[PDB]
């Protein structure tokens, strides 16, 4: 069973150990019923410059809402974050992929908007 302390990997090199495990009532949640799985580090992101990870998560949300497999070829230069935000506005969600999260303990909304979405992880 995946316990705490196992090593989990993105597709961009952010190595991460499983800290703790809370129950589904204990994790936060959106206005709908979606609850997240992983809480990665917004301090890790600027140090590693994983803007590729940010674009990957946003494109993943776009492709999941669209119903198609997204293409992430490096040297395409035909798709960009502006077109992706256009697809987000087409599907009704926020232009920059942030949403409102709700506390699982208190119930109050989180003061800041929170980034969310799917990606591909691997345990090691």
């Amino acid at each position: 069973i995946p316990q705490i302390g196992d090593k989990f990997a993105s597709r961009h090199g952010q190595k991460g150990t499983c800290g703790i495990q809370y129950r589904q009532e204990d994790m936060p949640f959106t206005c709908e019923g979606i609850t997240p799985d992983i809480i990665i580090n917004p301090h890790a992101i600027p140090s590693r410059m994983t803007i590729g990870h940010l674009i990957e998560c946003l494109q993943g949300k776009v492709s999941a809402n669209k119903g198609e497999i997204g293409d992430a070829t490096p040297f395409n230069d035909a798709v960009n974050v502006q077109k992706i935000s256009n697809l987000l506005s087409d599907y009704g969600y926020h232009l920059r992929g942030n949403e409102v999260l709700y506390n699982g303990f208190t119930g109050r909304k989180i003061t800041s908007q929170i980034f969310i979405g799917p990606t591909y992880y691997q345990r090691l």
């Binding site: 917004p42 301090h43 992101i45 600027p46 140090s47 410059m49 803007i51 940010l54 674009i55 946003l58 490096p74 040297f75 230069d77 960009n80 974050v81 935000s85 232009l95 920059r96 992929g97 942030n98 999260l101 208190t106 109050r108 989180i110 003061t111 800041s112 908007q113 929170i114 980034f115």
Partner: protein, 192 residues
């Protein structure tokens, strides 16, 4: 304990909205890099028609590469200054770097404005091929793009050539780290 709980109530994220800038400053960056590129092409044409007067103490080639490095450093510094002037003060990048936790003002510049010129062994990228850095460029050209300057940002994406140049830089950093750790271990053992 109490700062962790206040952070639990507050919430702190990073996102594309934080990493994106506005079109007017984007146009400022394109105008700045276009001015720098036409200026360095003017300097290159000056060296081609040999109006370049060599500085005493170094050759004409060294003077020319000093001129190129000075122009590119000034352009990159102006680009970073313009971006950090326009970081819009709601960026979590700005907030966390002001807190001093991680990252740097230049790291905002690479992630947002432009990567800039990358240097191998303290200079530009040499002509590994026959007087050319890549076969994708012509023979005997001294353009910043053809010699290792990146005109794009991380948000904009990179051409495969400058991606190869960034790979040059990253490999150079990694080999430095490895030999640094090994040699400082041996030296510390010697001192002990």
């Amino acid at each position: 304990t109490v700062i962790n709980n206040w952070l639990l109530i507050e919430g702190h994220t990073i996102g594309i909205g934080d990493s994106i800038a506005d079109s007017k400053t984007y146009q400022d960056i394109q105008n700045t890099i276009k001015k720098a590129k036409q200026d360095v092409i003017e300097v290159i044409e000056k060296a081609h028609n040999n109006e370049l007067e060599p500085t005493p103490g170094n050759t004409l080639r060294q003077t020319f590469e000093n001129q190129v490095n000075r122009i590119l450093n000034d352009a990159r510094d102006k680009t970073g200054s313009s971006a950090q002037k326009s970081l819009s003060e709601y960026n979590n990048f700005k907030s966390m770097v002001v807190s001093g936790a991680k990252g740097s003002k230049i790291n905002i510049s690479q992630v947002i404005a432009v990567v800039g010129q990358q240097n191998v062994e303290g200079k530009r990228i040499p002509f590994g091929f026959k007087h050319r850095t890549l076969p994708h460029f012509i023979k005997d050209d001294y353009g910043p793009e053809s010699r290792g300057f990146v005109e794009n940002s991380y948000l904009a994406g990179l051409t495969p050539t400058e991606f190869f140049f960034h790979a040059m830089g990253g490999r150079e950093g990694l080999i430095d780290t490895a030999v640094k750790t090994a040699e400082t271990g041996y030296i510390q053992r010697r001192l002990i």
